């Protein structure tokens, strides 16, 4: 058995808590609220026989983006993910900022960057929904471990994307 920590970061009002409630508390859609501070969720996965893994999802509040993103949150962290809403290019620039900040202020025992995945939040909404051609530019430029579309309300691809990300994380 093993335990790991994953930090979910992104822009404001992107349903940051919706995905983490869906994956752990089995709560999807619901009202849109503002996350004042860092909140936690627990996940247990039976990845293999006699090998059960625990995951601590930390959904960092993105309201204080201008404030110094303290390395204490990323301290001892084993994984991270950036999730941005697909209805704003400002969220895309914010995701670039999160990528730069984590690349600057995150370290691993091997020294290699920890896996990162680009989550396209709330694709089940018009009009900028399936613009994967534009997303591929940053997908290959940023050197992310993965990129995958998702919809928090419908939970269309949260499970497969999370499984791929965690398999990549234990792959290191």
């Amino acid at each position: 058995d093993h335990l790991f920590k994953v930090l979910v970061v992104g822009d404001a009002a992107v349903g940051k808590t919706s995905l983490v409630q869906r994956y752990s508390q089995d709560s999807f859609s619901k009202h849109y609220k503002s996350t004042v501070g860092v909140d936690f969720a627990l996940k247990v996965l039976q990845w293999s026989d006699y090998e059960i893994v625990r995951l601590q999802l930390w959904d960092i509040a993105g309201l204080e983006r201008f404030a110094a993103m303290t390395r204490l949150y990323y301290r001892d962290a084993s994984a991270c993910v950036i999730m941005f809403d697909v209805t704003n290019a400002t969220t895309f620039s914010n995701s670039q900022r999160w990528k730069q900040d984590l690349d600057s202020k995150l370290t691993l025992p091997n020294g290699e960057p920890v896996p990162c995945l680009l989550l396209a939040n709330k694709c089940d909404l018009s009009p900028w929904a399936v613009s994967r051609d534009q997303i591929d530019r940053f997908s290959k430029e940023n050197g992310f471990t993965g990129w995958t579309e998702t919809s928090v309300k419908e939970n269309k691809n949260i499970n497969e994307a999370m499984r791929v990300l965690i398999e990549k994380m234990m792959r290191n």
Partner: protein, 440 residues
């Protein structure tokens, strides 16, 4: 906010101590907050924190107390068990000397321990592999003060016994000696005695039935039963343990009867019949007495001690089983000594009706004449000289005088025929012999 403080300042033990105590008191105050922080990711996270901060005992004690007050009144899964029990066991092992840490850890383990069976077997084996039993026995045996920890320990070991791989593992460690020591060290308490007597029967193995441990166990069991004779639960548990010991080895009860165990049965038989009826408790005691009924030398010692005390109900049962009424040690006959110690008339009546040699009866007659008592001498003459042929033959005896009261009942006095419908003794003997014959 408190949780965030804890998380953002893991490097300091003081903030963890104060905030942990704060939210533990909050959780203890309001039950609603339970299972909300649990759903928020608090348990394994603080477990990792105590993994990070281990050099201090105060942090471990606060963490264990917080787990105790968090997990109370809740049921967890096997995964939570595997994620909680090993870490807290390692923490308790790392801080073994500090009493508060041990107390809080034992309380937490107690509140937290108790297809699906196959998964649970792995967790049970891993838990035993984590040396939980060694740590808990060492804690309860080394430090015998602060009774609460002892109680907690007993509770824990109880939940240990009813593991498949636990009985022999506990037998190796010698859990019996520690438990019996606790019972000796805490006679006056009820809960410690109550749990201990139940645990003694469950621990029983053929290794420790012999002398050196069986003799002490018999002394403790009699002391415990005698301490609380009226409490039904304590007596029931003690008799269940005694029955288990008797079933395991028949070499027992040789010293139990020696160590005044008869006082236990006779009072219970008297009390249970006079008080409310418990068929299970009564039959359990009767079955134990049936196992005691063998080795008739024990029966003879039982009769001598039963007849010494005014125990009219039991002596009839004992006679019905057997145990001939001429078991004198040649110092004085049974009828002689019973007549000496101001006994009830029904005692000498049952003695006379059963097999009693004439010479001892005449000795009893002379003794009863010395201490002038009309009822006993009248009952004695009813057997020495009266006929059928409606005739007295009160001859060769050297009685110094005669009084009308002495030979009162000797005359027929057909005014009424006395009725004695009390079948209590007869029934008790009937069940005892029924269990004796059926068991054999």
């Amino acid at each position: 906010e408190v949780m965030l403080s804890m998380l953002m300042h893991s490097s300091s033990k003081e903030v963890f101590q104060a905030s942990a105590n704060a939210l533990s008191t909050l959780l203890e105050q309001n039950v609603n907050f339970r299972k909300i922080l649990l759903s928020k990711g608090i348990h394994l996270n603080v477990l990792e924190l105590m993994q990070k901060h281990i050099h201090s005992p105060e942090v471990a004690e606060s963490g264990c107390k917080m787990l105790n007050h968090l997990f109370e009144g809740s049921n967890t899964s096997l995964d939570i068990m595997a994620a909680v029990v090993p870490k807290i066991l390692t923490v308790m092992k790392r801080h073994e000397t500090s009493l508060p840490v041990q107390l809080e850890a034992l309380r937490a383990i107690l509140h937290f321990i108790v297809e699906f069976h196959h998964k649970l077997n792995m967790v049970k084996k891993q838990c035993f592999k984590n040396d939980i039993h060694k740590l808990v026995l060492a804690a309860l045996n080394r430090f015998i003060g602060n009774p609460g920890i002892q109680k907690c320990g007993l509770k824990v070991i109880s939940s240990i016994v009813h593991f498949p791989d636990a009985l022999e593992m506990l037998s190796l460690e010698g859990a019996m000696d520690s438990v019996l020591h606790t019972l000796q060290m805490y006679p006056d308490d009820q809960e410690i005695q109550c749990l201990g007597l139940s645990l003694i029967g469950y621990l029983i193995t053929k290794k420790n039935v012999f002398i050196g441990t069986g003799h002490l166990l018999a002394k403790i069991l009699v002391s415990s039963l005698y301490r609380f004779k009226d409490v039904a639960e304590i007596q029931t548990k003690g008799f269940q343990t005694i029955l288990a010991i008797l079933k395991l080895s028949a070499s027992f009860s040789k010293l139990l009867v020696h160590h005044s165990f008869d006082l236990v049965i006779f009072h219970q038989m008297s009390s249970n019949i006079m008080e409310q009826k418990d068929q299970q408790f009564l039959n359990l005691c009767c079955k134990c007495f049936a196992k005691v009924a063998m080795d008739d030398y024990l029966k003879n010692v039982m009769l001598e001690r039963a007849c010494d005390q005014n125990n009219s109900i039991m002596v009839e049962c004992l006679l019905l089983l057997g145990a001939d009424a001429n078991q004198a040690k040649e110092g004085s006959s049974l009828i002689c000594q019973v007549c000496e110690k101001e006994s009830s008339p029904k005692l000498v009546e049952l003695l006379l009706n059963s097999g009693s040699r004439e010479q001892d009866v005449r000795k009893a007659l002379t003794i009863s004449i010395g201490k002038g008592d009309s009822q006993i001498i009248s009952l004695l003459l009813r057997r020495l000289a009266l006929d059928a042929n409606n005739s007295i033959c009160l001859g060769g005896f050297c009685i110094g005088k005669v009084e009308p009261s002495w030979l009162g009942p000797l005359f027929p006095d057909k005014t009424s025929n006395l009725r004695k419908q009390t079948n209590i003794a007869s029934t008790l003997a009937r069940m005892v012999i029924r269990y004796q014959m059926k068991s054999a």
